[PDB]
Write a protein that binds this ligand. Structure first.
Ligand code: MG
Ligand code: MG
Ligand code: MG
Ligand code: MG
Lengths: 115, 116, 116, 115
C-alpha cells in the first residue's frame, strides 16, 4: 500500500466516513488524468488506491470532496474541495499517508512519508 | 478589499514573505481563467488583488506557491503548492480573508468571511 | 503592544468574538501567578494585555476559554480550554502574536514573533 | 485501550518518535496529579496508558514535551510543551485518540472519539 489517505472530522471528533476522493496524475500534456479513487471507510481511511509498480515518480493530485461531506451533515462549507498536490519521489522505499483534518471553513493536510 | 491573503511560516514563527500566488476564476466552459496574482509583503499579506466590481460571483482558486518558498529557505517540501478553491459572492458581496499556515510537510488554510 | 491574541472560528469562518482568556506568569516558586486577562473583540483580537516594561522575561501561559465559547453557541466541545505555554523575551524584548483556530474537537495555535 | 496518543512531525513528514508525555488527572484539590506517562513509539503512538476500569470520568491533562523533541532535532521551538485538557465522559463505549501535529512555532491537536 504505497499511498493511503486518512480523513478526520474536527466538528464531530470522528473519522470522516464516506468521503469521496479522486487521485490524478499529471500528464506530459500538463493536464490531470484520472489515476484512482474511492470513498473513505468507517475508519476514515482509503487503502488500496495503487500498487508499488503503478505508483511511479510524477506529480499527483488528491481531490477530497469535502463539500459533499459537509452538505450531507447539513453544515455550510467554504471550500469546493480539498486538494493535495505533490511529487512522488523514489528515495529508498517510501510509503505515503495523506492525512486531512476537516472543518467547515478550514482544513489542514499533512504528509507522513515512511520507509 | 474584498479578497486578501495572509501566509504564515510555522517553522520560523513569522510572516511568510515574498510568497507568490495566483488567483483563477472558473469560466463558463469549466476552464480556469487567470484572475489576479501577486506576492506577499513583509507582513505576509497580499492586498489589492481585486475590487468589489470585478470580484463577481463565481468559483475561484487561489494557488499559493509554497514549494518555491521552502526551496529558497533550503528546504525540500512535500507539496507542490497549496490551493484554495471556493465559491464566492453567491449570496451577495462578501469580504474574504484566505489564511495559510505553512510547514514543510503540512499546511492549513482557513477562510474568514465577513459581510460589508 | 508586545502581546496580542487572535482567535478564529473554523466552523463559521469568522473571528471568535467574546472569548475569555487569562494570562499567567510562572513565579520563582514555580506557581502560576495571574498576569493579565481580557476578552476578544468583534475582530477576534485582544490588544493591550501588557506593556514592554511589565512584560519581562519569563514563562507565560495563555489560557483561552474555548469551552464557554462553544457552549454559548450550542456545542459541547472536547477541550476544556486551549492553553499556550512559552518562554518570552529571553533574548531581549519581542512582540508576540498568539493565534488560535478553533473547532469543537480540534484547535491549532501558532505564534508570530517579531523583533521591534 | 481507552486512551491513545499519536504525534506527527510536520517539518519532517514523519511520526514524532520518542516524544515524552505525561497524563494527569484533576484532583478534588483542583491540582494536577500524575496518572500515566510514556514515550511515543517509532510510529509516533503511545498505547496502554490506562484501562477501562481506571479511566473514569473526570478532567484529564495530556502534556506533550514538544520542546525536548525540537531541541533534539536542533530546531528552536516556541512552546514549552503542548497541553490537551478535556473531560472524559461516559456516553456509551468511548475510546479517545489524542492526535497532535507539531511544528516549531505551531501545533494542532484533535480528538477522535469512537465507539
Ligand atoms: Mg530522482
Ligand atoms: Mg444566485
Ligand atoms: Mg538571560
Ligand atoms: Mg454524566
Amino acid at each position: 500500500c504505497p499511498l493511503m489517505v486518512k480523513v478526520l472530522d474536527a466538528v464531530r471528533g470522528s473519522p470522516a466516513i464516506n468521503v469521496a476522493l479522486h487521485v490524478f496524475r499529471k500528464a506530459a500534456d500538463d493536464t490531470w488524468e484520472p489515476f484512482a479513487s474511492g470513498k473513505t471507510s468507517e475508519s476514515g481511511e482509503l487503502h488500496g488506491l495503487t500498487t508499488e509498480e503503478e505508483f511511479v515518480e510524477g506529480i499527483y493530485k488528491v481531490e477530497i470532496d469535502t463539500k459533499s461531506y459537509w452538505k450531507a451533515l447539513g453544515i455550510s462549507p467554504f471550500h469546493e474541495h480539498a486538494e493535495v498536490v505533490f511529487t512522488a519521489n523514489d528515495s529508498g522505499p517510501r510509503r505515503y499517508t495523506i492525512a486531512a483534518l476537516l472543518s467547515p471553513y478550514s482544513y489542514s493536510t499533512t504528509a507522513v512519508v515512511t520507509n
